[PDB]
Write a protein that binds this ligand. Structure first.
Ligand SMILES: Cc1cc2nc3c(=O)[nH]c(=O)nc-3n(C[C@H](O)[C@H](O)[C@H](O)COP(=O)(O)OP(=O)(O)OC[C@H]3O[C@@H](n4cnc5c(N)ncnc54)[C@H](O)[C@@H]3O)c2cc1C
Lengths: 15, 133, 666
């Protein structure tokens, strides 16, 4: 989940 | 071991500016205040000097006299002797002054006159009475 | 540098002196006669030359001996000791080379390396060369770490570092000979553009650049000569010293203005005294002239008292008239002096608003190089490693820096997507607990003889800890982790389809409106042979811009670019990327910096391995178990790729000495 957990926060900061 | 050319960093000034957070602000605005004060004093004295320059306008041209030149003569006339006695009474030991008064006697002939007419003209007590003024 | 002296220079070694490490390994020689020291030094420099002349293949001991010349090849055990010393400490046979003596299948010792960065990869390659069993654990789905190259189509741009800071004495020179790296020079020519878009006049660019260098020298003087390194019991930063120096320059400007106007008032009051005397003299002259005329109008013939009165008034008037003449002469002198003074006022200010803005741009370039605001850098120690800069012009990798770690990863056992959570080190060995990043329920246990920690300083700083050490790291290590600074800087890759900028210009700047935003997209890179521009974010802007979306960031980029190259010459970019290194949890920042309150001794403390206590009470504890390498552990080359490389080589040599025995010291 940690790959999926970092991806969502990175996309959060990405938008 | 020295500041780079044109940079000014003294031991006093560094401790002055870093004394607190706004010590630099205090120093700089005090300098600004002194600058303003000196500039306004400059303007004031400019005004005063302008007035004084206006009062001298015209110069001394309507007060100059044509300076007549006459050549020295070795002989002393009675007129010149009396002029010399009065010039001693008025000017004291100013030999240049007495020479310009008499008009045709060099500066050395005045001291000569002082010596020669030592007591026929009582020059000592004449100078005494001059020293009372 | 040329010959064997050049080989020593290229290996960062003095050619005419033995180093402290060489003294530790060859104490019989350095304590003995100077002749034997020179023999040692020649064998060392010559082996280094042989390696550097062809770093594509392994340099064996037999090859070194038979390429040598007598009398030097006569003492074979000294040659062997020198060769094994250089091989062990990573000065020869490092990187990627064709092996001659193939690796022994019989391995010795287990080392777990945390992280497949450049330091970890180099240390793994070295320990594998020494016959040890090495396994790397990396949380990302890729090697390289902070060497990160974006690729799409044939568009390539480094979000990590992209600059090789010189090849003179750089191990990356050896690496670049070993790898297919396309190196390209950097034309340091850099025009500026103010916020409106107007280019900065060249003269003014040079004015402010010189003043910036002079301000830096002034801070150096402030530090060394006046001991201005502590203020109210706090360490002084480079920014504090720069503020103080600028404030003192402005103070000096105001002092000069005061001095000038004070000479003006002095001269004007001289003039006032003179004019007052001239007025009184003109009045006396008027009265004397009327007296003269009255006396002179007593018509002759006159008794001698009246004649004397006339002549006396005459010359009295003449004397006063030439008094007035000389005073008017002095008046003219003073008036022309005053006109000169009022025509030559000193400097108006220290810096204009435009001057200060361009100076802020230079400060932003400094903050970019150091990856931190100047208010964080240590005034005393921020420029410590400047002594060890390499010669040659700074270059870049036109095909992507990632080709170096990738090529270093060949043949190594690397566990990607493996996040280390806990490092347990005991008297009898170590175990590393890790998780699969894709599903964190899954857990792994790795047992080993030694652990090499490559974790970035940002990760070690993380509170609450991302990685837990059992037992806790001693206080002298955690305090060093606290004191050191970990900075941040970001990049924006803008991929177009048309080149709309100056192709001959590698890079150009943009001056900020305010001091605060001086790092906000202050610099643009045109390196890659493709329609790609690289915007750079540094300073406080680096941290603040991470909480701002890619749309807004690329919009500000395109606004600046329209203002510089025209509102129509700038097409919408096809592809864009925005790095966020402080947010990246496998880095938590860009690279280290010498924080105020820190020093290089903290960089040395970071490298000190940890020796666990004894399992049985009263038992001897010789062996250390926890080793540290990476960007933040090398005092003389921090914040660099070559620094990480060298730290990895160092720790591999140390671990090999500890667990395989140092044969070259007897
Ligand atoms: C934006 C930027 C630009 C740079 N530009 C340059 C430049 O131009 N020139 C230059 O010389 N240097 C530059 N550098 C510095 C250089 O990239 C680094 O110093 C170096 O590449 C890092 O080496 P390292 O192996 O010590 O660190 P890292 O490569 O970061 O090693 C740590 C590795 O371990 C991984 N890891 C982290 N946490 C865990 C965990 N819990 N479990 C497992 N693995 C983990 C990380 O993902 C990483 O792969 C730049 C750095 C940045 C950030």
């Amino acid at each position: 989940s940690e790959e999926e957990r970092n991806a969502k926060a990175e996309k959060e900061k990405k938008l | 071991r020295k500041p780079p050319k044109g940079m000014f960093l003294s031991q006093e000034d560094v401790e002055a500016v870093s004394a607190n957070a706004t010590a630099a602000t205090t120093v700089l605005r005090q300098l600004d205040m002194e600058l303003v004060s000196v500039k306004r004093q400059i303007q004031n004295i400019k005004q005063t000097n302008s007035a004084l320059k206006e009062k001298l306008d015209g110069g001394i041209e309507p007060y100059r006299l044509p300076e007549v030149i006459q050549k020295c003569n070795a002989r002393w006339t009675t007129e010149e002797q009396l002029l010399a006695v009065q010039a001693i009474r008025k000017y004291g030991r100013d030999f240049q002054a007495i020479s310009d008064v008499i008009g045709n006697k060099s500066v050395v002939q005045v001291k000569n006159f002082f010596v020669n007419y030592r007591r026929r003209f009582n020059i000592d007590e004449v100078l005494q009475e001059w020293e009372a003024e | 540098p040329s010959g064997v002296e050049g080989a020593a220079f290229q290996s960062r070694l003095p050619h005419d002196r033995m180093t402290s490490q060489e003294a530790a390994c060859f104490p019989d020689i350095i304590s003995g006669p100077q002749q034997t020291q020179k023999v040692f030094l020649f064998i060392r420099n010559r082996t280094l030359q042989l390696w550097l002349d062809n770093p594509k293949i392994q340099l064996t001991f037999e090859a070194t001996l038979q390429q040598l010349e007598a009398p030097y090849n006569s003492d074979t055990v000294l040659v062997h000791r020198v060769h094994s010393y250089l091989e062990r400490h990573g000065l020869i046979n490092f990187g990627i080379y064709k092996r001659i003596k193939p690796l022994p299948t019989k391995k010795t010792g287990k080392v777990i390396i945390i992280g497949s960065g450049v330091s970890g990869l180099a240390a793994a390659r070295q320990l594998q060369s020494f016959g040890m069993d090495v396994t790397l654990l990396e949380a990302r789905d890729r090697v390289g770490g902070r060497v990160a190259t974006f690729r799409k189509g044939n568009y390539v741009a480094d979000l990590g570092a992209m600059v090789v800071t010189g090849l003179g004495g750089n191990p990356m020179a050896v690496v670049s000979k070993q790898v297919n790296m396309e190196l390209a020079k950097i034309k340091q020519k850099c025009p500026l553009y103010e916020a409106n878009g107007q280019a900065v006049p060249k003269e003014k660019d040079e004015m402010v650049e010189q003043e910036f260098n002079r301000l830096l020298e002034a801070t150096s003087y402030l530090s060394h000569q006046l001991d201005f390194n502590v203020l109210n019991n706090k360490p002084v930063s480079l920014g504090q010293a720069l503020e103080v120096v600028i404030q003192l320059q402005e103070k000096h400007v105001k002092d000069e203005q005061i001095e000038h106007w004070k000479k003006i008032v002095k001269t004007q009051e001289e003039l006032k005294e003179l004019l007052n005397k001239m007025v009184n003299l003109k009045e006396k002259i008027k009265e004397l002239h009327q007296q003269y005329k009255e006396a002179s109008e007593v018509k002759p013939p006159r008794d001698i008292t009246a004649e004397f009165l006339v002549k006396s008034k005459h010359r009295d008037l003449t004397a006063l008239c030439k008094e007035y003449d000389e005073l008017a002469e002095t008046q003219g002198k003073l008036e022309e002096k005053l006109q000169e003074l009022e025509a030559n006022p000193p400097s108006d200010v220290y810096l204009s608003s435009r001057d200060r803005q361009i100076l802020d741009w230079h400060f932003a370039n400094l903050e970019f190089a150091n990856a931190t605001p100047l208010s964080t850098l240590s005034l005393k120690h921020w420029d410590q490693d400047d002594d060890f800069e390499f010669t040659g012009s700074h270059l870049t990798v036109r095909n992507g820096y990632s080709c170096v770690p990738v090529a270093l990863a060949e043949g190594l056992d690397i566990k990607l997507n493996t996040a280390v959570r806990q490092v347990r080190y005991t008297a009898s060995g170590c175990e590393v607990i890790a998780v699969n990043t894709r599903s964190t329920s899954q857990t792994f246990i790795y047992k080993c003889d030694a652990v090499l920690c490559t974790l970035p300083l940002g990760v070690l700083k993380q509170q609450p800890p991302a990685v837990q050490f059992v037992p806790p790291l001693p206080e002298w290590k955690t305090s060093a982790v606290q004191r050191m600074g970990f900075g941040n800087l970001n990049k924006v890759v803008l991929c177009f389809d048309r080149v709309f900028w100056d192709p001959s210009v590698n890079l150009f700047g943009h001056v900020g409106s305010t001091t605060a935003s001086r790092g906000e997209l202050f610099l643009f890179w045109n390196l890659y042979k493709a329609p790609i521009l690289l915007a750079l974010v540094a300073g406080e802007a680096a941290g603040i811009m991470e909480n701002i979306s890619d749309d807004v960031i690329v919009g500000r980029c395109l606004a600046i670019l329209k203002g510089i190259f025209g509102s129509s010459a700038v097409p919408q970019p096809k592809e864009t990327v925005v790095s966020r290194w402080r947010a990246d949890p496998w880095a938590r920042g860009s690279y280290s910096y010498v924080a105020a309150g820190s020093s290089g001794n903290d960089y040395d403390l970071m490298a000190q391995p940890i020796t666990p206590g004894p399992s049985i009470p009263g038992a001897p504890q010789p062996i250390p178990r926890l080793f540290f390498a990476g960007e933040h552990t090398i005092r003389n080359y921090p914040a660099t790729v070559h620094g990480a490389l060298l730290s990895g080589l160092r720790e591999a040599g140390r671990i090999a000495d500890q667990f395989l025995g140092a044969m070259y010291t007897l």
